[PDB]
């Protein structure tokens, strides 16, 4: 009798039990041990290398494992693969669709990812023997805007689309090996853990659901946010991750706690976050807000270590190298400022 | 070596920059356009009547040597708080509104709310909207047949009359023109409620005449860039 209402009541009581279990292990918080570590100070990073090669606004970027070649996406249909060490554009990939929202550099540097409102993840070969770049694989199985994607390897990647479901693709075959379904809102970003075994994806339902790339199911669901989680990044330790949403507050969730540990909020900044990345140590939380400035939040004291000047438009993409050497923040002014 | 791979990378960057400067000309030439609606609001008839043109994702047309990039969104999902932000550098947001579906759900109020969210947006606030009051061929008789009345979903119709600057169609009942201009002014109310001066609505009436519809888009985008440059030079 009344399967809908009864199942909704069981879901409500399960959520209440989960919240009670979270609060039971929440005797303290991340700010309760704030007196054990020294602060970091206002470290105002400067633009070491500027990248001005795009024609339209830059929506996505991604770093490589070599920490030298970075990729960036813009609505002009160009996927510029920059060289951060010498300020050189290695490739200018002519994209099939103009509007693109994702970027994913392969861990080996041979592949790269694309995609946007076309609902198609365009994989391009970089180290191919054919000279210029070309479409290495056409992942077309999503019904929503392909928001973000991450490169696990040259064989299989996972893309966060706008159809409320993510999917672990396969560059060898071209089909979704497993679909990550369960997000109530359209997914906006995903990030791979350093162990590459499990990933978390932040959607527009204030719930960054943690998935398992192996089993294809949702491990945990982190409902600590308030607005559309536009950005996400897994802590370099592999057991935690930060989230940037539209509520102007960043939150650092932990997989082993299933709840938020620190909420990076500030009354001076009311605009939402669409860029979140961690340094080599994870102490600095690079957070690209919508106020044309990226806030370097301290992941242990909940205080920005200095906003970033330069960009005059919304910074929708920001990423730190695999060794934390430099962070390249690209905004909607077709520019990429690499901070250090 | 010392200058072997570095010079190769520099010349590759130079070739890429040359290609990018060549593509910037056509990028500034192809004024991107956003074609959307409140759901089956007659946008398919607009894609059909646009240069006679991977399904409904993007169509391109060129008039007076001015090419355009009309990106249709007839294949995305209903939630539009993220993909609509990708149209921040877009030139014109062609809003195809079903002007006769006010009774059918109240699709007219849905289109009004969509236009309000597009206008007061944080990124779409600097972009005008080519309001295409589609389905006028049905509105020609929708108000007389009584099957779809404005007062059933808009009480301001009784307090509204045809404006003095109205341009009625030859052979139209005054009630039809009154309802059409009421929808136009109801859109323009929330259009001008922003008070920023960076974007203004371009209300047109389509689906009534089967002539070149992209000519209206051309004449609208012309004035769009006109007013954009005027605001840039503080002339308007």
């Amino acid at each position, epitope marked *: 009798g009344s399967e809908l209402d009864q199942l*909704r009541q069981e879901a409500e009581q399960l*959520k209440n039990q989960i*919240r009670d279990a979270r609060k039971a292990c929440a005797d303290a918080t991340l700010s309760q041990i704030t007196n054990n570590i020294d602060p970091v100070g206002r470290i105002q990073m400067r633009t070491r290398r500027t990248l001005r090669g795009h024609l339209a606004k830059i929506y996505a970027m991604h770093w490589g494992t070599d920490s030298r070649l970075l990729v960036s996406a813009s609505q002009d249909g160009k996927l510029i693969i920059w060289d951060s060490y010498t300020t050189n554009k290695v490739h200018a990939i002519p994209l099939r669709s103009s509007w693109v929202m994702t970027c994913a550099y392969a861990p080996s540097g041979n592949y790269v990812a694309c995609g946007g409102l076309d609902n198609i993840c365009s994989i391009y070969n970089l180290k191919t023997r054919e000279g210029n770049v070309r479409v290495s694989r056409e992942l077309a199985g999503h019904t929503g805007y392909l928001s973000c994607c991450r490169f696990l390897d040259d064989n299989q990647i996972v893309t966060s689309s706008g159809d*409320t479901t993510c999917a672990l693709w396969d560059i060898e075959t071209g089909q979704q090996t497993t679909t990550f379904t369960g997000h*109530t*809102g359209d997914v906006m970003s995903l990030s791979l853990a350093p162990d590459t075994r499990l990933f978390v994806s932040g*959607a*527009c*339902d*204030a*719930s960054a659901k943690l998935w398992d790339v192996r089993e294809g199911m949702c491990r945990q669901t982190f*409902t*600590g946010h*308030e*607005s*559309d989680i536009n950005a996400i990044c897994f802590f370099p330790n592999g057991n935690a991750f930060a989230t940037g949403s*539209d*509520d*102007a507050t960043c939150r650092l969730f932990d997989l082993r706690a299933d709840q938020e540990l620190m909420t990076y909020s500030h009354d001076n900044i*009311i*605009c*939402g976050i669409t860029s979140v990345s961690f340094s080599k140590s994870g102490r600095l939380l690079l957070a690209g807000y919508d106020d044309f400035n990226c806030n370097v939040w301290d992941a242990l004291k909940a205080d920005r270590a200095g906003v970033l000047a330069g960009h005059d438009n919304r910074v929708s993409c920001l990423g730190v190298t695999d060794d934390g050497m430099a962070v390249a923040t690209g905004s909607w002014d077709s520019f990429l400022k690499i901070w250090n | 070596d010392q200058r072997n791979e570095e010079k190769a990378q520099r010349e590759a960057n130079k070739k890429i920059e040359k290609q990018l400067q060549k593509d910037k000309q056509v990028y500034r030439a192809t004024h991107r356009l956003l074609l959307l609606g409140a*759901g089956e609001s007659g946008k398919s008839t607009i894609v059909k009547q646009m240069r006679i043109l991977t399904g409904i994702f993007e169509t391109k047309f060129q008039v007076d040597k001015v090419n355009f990039h009309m990106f249709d969104v007839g294949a995305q999902r*209903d*939630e*539009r*708080r993220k993909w*609509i932000q990708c149209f921040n550098d877009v030139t014109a947001i062609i809003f195809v509104v079903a002007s006769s579906s006010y009774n059918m*759900t*109240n699709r007219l*109020q*849905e289109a009004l*709310n*969509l236009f*309000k*969210s*597009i*206008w*007061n*947006n*944080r990124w*779409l606030r600097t972009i005008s909207v080519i309001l295409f009051l589609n389905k006028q061929d049905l509105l020609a008789e929708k108000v007389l047949a009584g099957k779809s009345k404005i007062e*059933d*979903y*808009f*009480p*301001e119709f009784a307090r509204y009359t045809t404006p003095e600057d109205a341009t009625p169609e030859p052979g139209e009942d005054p009630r039809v023109t009154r309802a059409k201009y009421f929808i136009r002014d109801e859109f323009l109310r929330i259009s001008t409620a922003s008070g920023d001066g960076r974007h203004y609505c371009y209300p047109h009436f389509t689906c009534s005449v089967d002539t070149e519809n992209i000519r209206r888009v051309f004449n609208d985008c012309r004035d769009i860039i006109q007013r954009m440059h005027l605001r840039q030079y503080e002339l308007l």
Partner: nanobody
Amino acid sequence: QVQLQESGGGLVQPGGSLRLSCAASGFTFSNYKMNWVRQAPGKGLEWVSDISQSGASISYTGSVKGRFTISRDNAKNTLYLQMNSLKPEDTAVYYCARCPAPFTRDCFDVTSTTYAYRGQGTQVTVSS
């Protein structure tokens, strides 16, 4: 968790009065442009009312303009929809769809089902 529980509603007489108490917990209620949407049996989700972050930009749809009355309570973190002079077309499940982006006058919460920051749904019905 962004949860919205709409108390009240039920089955009343057409033309009477009704008040919905939407419990807005899990977010800063005084910073989101909370609004009201309904879903009639067989009809899609249509926007009903709206109120600003502080209560200035108050707007309703044409079907409830003048009849309904919205009032946000930033102290109690709840959204009220005072329904007056109901109509037979008010047979719908009223949802508490919230503006996702705070400090903004824009949101697309008039979307179809499976919306994130929407109420759980109260069955507001009228007799005949």
